[PDB]
Amino acid sequence: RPQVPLRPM
Amino acid sequence: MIQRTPKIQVYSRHPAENGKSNFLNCYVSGFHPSDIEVDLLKNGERIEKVEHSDLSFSKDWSFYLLYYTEFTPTEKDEYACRVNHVTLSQPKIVKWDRDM
Amino acid sequence: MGSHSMRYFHTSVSRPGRGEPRFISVGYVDDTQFVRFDSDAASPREEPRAPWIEQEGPEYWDRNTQIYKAQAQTDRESLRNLRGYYNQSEAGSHTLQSMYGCDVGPDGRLLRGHNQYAYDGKDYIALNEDLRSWTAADTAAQITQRKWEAARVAEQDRAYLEGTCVEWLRRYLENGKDTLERADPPKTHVTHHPISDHEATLRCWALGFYPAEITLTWQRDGEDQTQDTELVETRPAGDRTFQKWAAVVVPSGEEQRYTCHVQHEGLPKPLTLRWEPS
């Protein structure tokens, strides 16, 4: 299962 | 920026035998950016029922896609894959060779 | 080696004048794709791409769908910020790619984790093998690095890679074992094609194998012919299996000095093949 996104670049 | 031209292979899923149904594949790889147009051709004419794999890429970030269709090869029908990409000044046509 | 990997591969491509950037994600276990998501689909949803994932319940698909929708939005912000970090105009198309996931051994334990990115086909930033620190490619990626240190991003990425990634990979392996833990050996043959009165091509074929990793070499009098072997890229057959060939042009009459050597996980032992004219 995919990872929750955290912060943009 | 980085542009990389597609490698192109055209081949069958199983060894060809005239009159036996099979799949015709066109594998485009090693390219960047991801925008690419691919047609499979039977005696020069675009085949309509052609599907492709979901876009993915290699460890070096270059893209790859498999385009494919069901076909029944015969002695005289010629098949090919026609590819256009921003790296090509005209579309590239690669003929199916049953031994490659 | 008995090892396995799970990877997610994301592609975000801007297209000024033609909407918001497209987001595509695909997920793999080893050489087997098992899920996709595409923001341009009519009703974007995580979708199954292998049979053994279909059993997962609606909460799985719903939750993952929400994750990809969040990831697309995060990538769109990333693209905007990257354009500024490189002083680029708003008129051109750009690409952000992401790779992440875990490798485990035969016992299911973490061997290595991965979380890295490329912009316009060039490495941008990568989580180091320690899962604690970053490597930035240039002064733009140093801004990302500073932001991600300040937000403790690496700690979160580590927790995913050591925890969820491993645990879900183990489940996938156990649910898809009949295919994912099955190596199919190559079917092999050598063909011979005269090119002139004095030369012929020997082509060594490997068909029907899984996983993709294979080594096909030609030797002449037992010396590797690295420089004189035409090797095609390993290519998908479309039925989960892969294909590859290696060819050498040899002097007519000297075919018997050439041997094709084949190594693959599915073989009890490496193969040595010669052209056998029937």
Numbering used by the authors:
A (entry chain C): 1 to 9
B (entry chain B): 0 to 99
C (entry chain A): 0 to 277
Task: Give me lines lifted from the publication on this model.
The HLAI residues that are polymorphic are mainly those forming the peptide-binding groove, which contains six binding pockets (A to F) that define the size and chemical characteristics of the specific peptide repertoire that can be accommodated by each HLAI molecule. In this study we focus on two HIV-1-specific epitopes and their presentation by 4 different members of the HLA-B7 superfamily, HLA-B*07:02, HLA-B*42:01, HLA-B*42:02 and HLA-B*81:01. We show that single polymorphisms between different alleles of the HLA-B7 superfamily can induce a conformational switch in peptide conformation that is associated with differential HLAI-specific escape mutation and immune control.
To better understand the mechanisms underlying the observed differential HIV-1 selection pressure imposed on HIV-1 by distinct HLAI molecules within the B7 superfamily, we focused on two epitopes, TL9-p24 and RM9-Nef, that dominate the HIV-1-specific CD8 T-cell response in the Southern African HIV-1 epidemic. These two epitopes were presented by all four of these HLAI molecules, other than TL9-p24 which was presented by all except HLA-B*42:02. To explore this notion, we first solved the atomic structures of HLA-B*07:02, HLA-B*42:01 and HLA-B*81:01 with TL9-p24. In addition, we solved the atomic structures of HLA-B*07:02, HLA-B*42:01, HLA-B*42:02 and HLA-B*81:01 with RM9-Nef (see below). Pro2 and Met9 acted as primary anchor residues and Arg1, Val4 and Arg7 pointed away from the groove for potential TCR interactions. Leu6 was in an identical position within HLA-B*42:01 and HLA-B*42:02, but moved by 3 Å in HLA-B*81:01 and 1.5 Å in HLA-B*07:02. (D) HLA-B*81:01 contains a Leu at position 147 compared to Trp in HLA-B*07:02, HLA-B*42:01 and HLA-B*42:02. This polymorphism reduces the interactions between residues Pro8 and Met9 in the peptide and HLA-B*81:01 compared to the other HLAIs. HLA-B*42:02 has a unique polymorphism within the B-pocket and contains His at residue 9 as opposed to Tyr9 in HLA-B*07:02, HLA-B*42:01 and HLA-B*81:01 molecules. This polymorphism reduces the interactions between residue Pro2 in the peptide and HLA-B*42:02 compared to the other HLAIs.
